[PDB]
Amino acid sequence: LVERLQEEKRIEAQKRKERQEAHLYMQVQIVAEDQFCGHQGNDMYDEEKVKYTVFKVLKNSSLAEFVQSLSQTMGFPQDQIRLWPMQARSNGTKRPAMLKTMIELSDNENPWTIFLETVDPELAASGATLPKFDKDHDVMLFLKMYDPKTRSLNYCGHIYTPISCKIRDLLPVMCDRAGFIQDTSLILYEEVKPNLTERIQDYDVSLDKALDELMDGDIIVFQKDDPENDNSELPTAKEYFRDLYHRVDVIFCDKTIPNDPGFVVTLSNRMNYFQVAKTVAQRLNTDPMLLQFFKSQRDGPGNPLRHNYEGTLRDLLQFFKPRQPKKLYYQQLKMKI
Amino acid sequence: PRKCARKTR
Ligand SMILES: [Cl-]
Ligand SMILES: [Cl-]
Ligand SMILES: [Cl-]
């Protein structure tokens, strides 16, 4: 007790000095390209699913300090890395941007997230190096290949190119990264923002003119022109991103089975009662009639939803916060008595 | 030719 009661005072002493100091510090979240592979969504990665390396850094510390700590921590030379701060934009995108105190560089943002380009350690073992970047005449671009058969996106890395380069001149690389033959016919889009995927028509103009509002971190999506895919449910990247925009995963818990973890169903925000009900039924091998849904409140099932509801799944889900997992309670009614 | 400094739509 005697020496035990001193340690309980030492712990409250150290934990209060840290509470006071915590305003002097900021999070820097380092995200690495390997996290972009497999991402099926808009922009480069999912904020929630991605995995960061995390740095606790004095707000008024310098960049050079961070870089040094960074290169030594991560195990790279200082001149074999490039920092591309992630920038939340007004149009609803977050993108690597181009790059005094850390906090002023983050534009007061905290946590600050940064895309750290490095060389692939495998390829660097055989003499690969960080390519240089004329911050004025070059642009960094991201490539995605859409496959209409599987209706999926396939990250195809990034490229450094002179801004003055023709779109046509990039086709060989897209074809190659996608595993296609040179001079395979491609349809190209700028992924602009969610629900905006503009086709690029003139391939014989510079990148400044081809994309609207050209910046580093811009994304071009491409795809074959295979006829077998006219058949497909989402024949183009444009249509794929539209489907995605209106997409939502909802968890359905059976109110009568308490603590039922429930199951996830992928629905559309622009569905109606019938569509919602019918989908969930096909999952349970039952009749839509036999399902009663309850509204969303608190945690717990709310008021019962009436089957003549005229609204949309959006309307039902409009009281959920961005990070909140979307859940609706239901229960099953009897066929006979 | 140049990059834009900011998006606006
Ligand atoms: Cl809409
Ligand atoms: Cl629909
Ligand atoms: Cl009533």
Residue numbers in the entry:
A (entry chain A): 540 to 638, 646 to 843, 846 to 885
B (entry chain D): 618 to 626
Publication text:
Ubiquitin specific protease 7 (USP7) catalyzes the deubiquitination of many cellular proteins involved in tumor suppression, neural stem cell maintenance, DNA damage and immune responses. In fact USP7 was first discovered through its strong and specific interaction with the ICP0 protein of HSV-1, leading to its original name of Herpesvirus Associated USP (HAUSP). The fact that several proteins bind to the C-terminal ubiquitin-like domains of USP7 prompted us to identify and characterize the interaction mechanism.
The crystal structure of Ubl123-ICP0 peptide complex was determined to 2.9 Å resolution. The ICP0 peptide binds to a predominantly negatively charged area between 758DELMDGD764 on Ubl2. These two lysine residues belong to the central part of the peptide (KCARKT), which is in close contact with USP7 due to a backbone-to-backbone hydrogen bond (ICP0 nitrogen-C621 with USP7 oxygen-L760). The only strong hydrogen bond between Ubl2 and Ubl3 is formed between the protein backbone of residues H792 and N814. The compact conformation appears to be stabilized by a salt bridge between R871 of Ubl3 and D587 of Ubl1. In the compact conformation of Ubl123, the distance between the catalytic domain and Ubl45 is drastically reduced from 75 Å (extended conformation) to 50 Å.
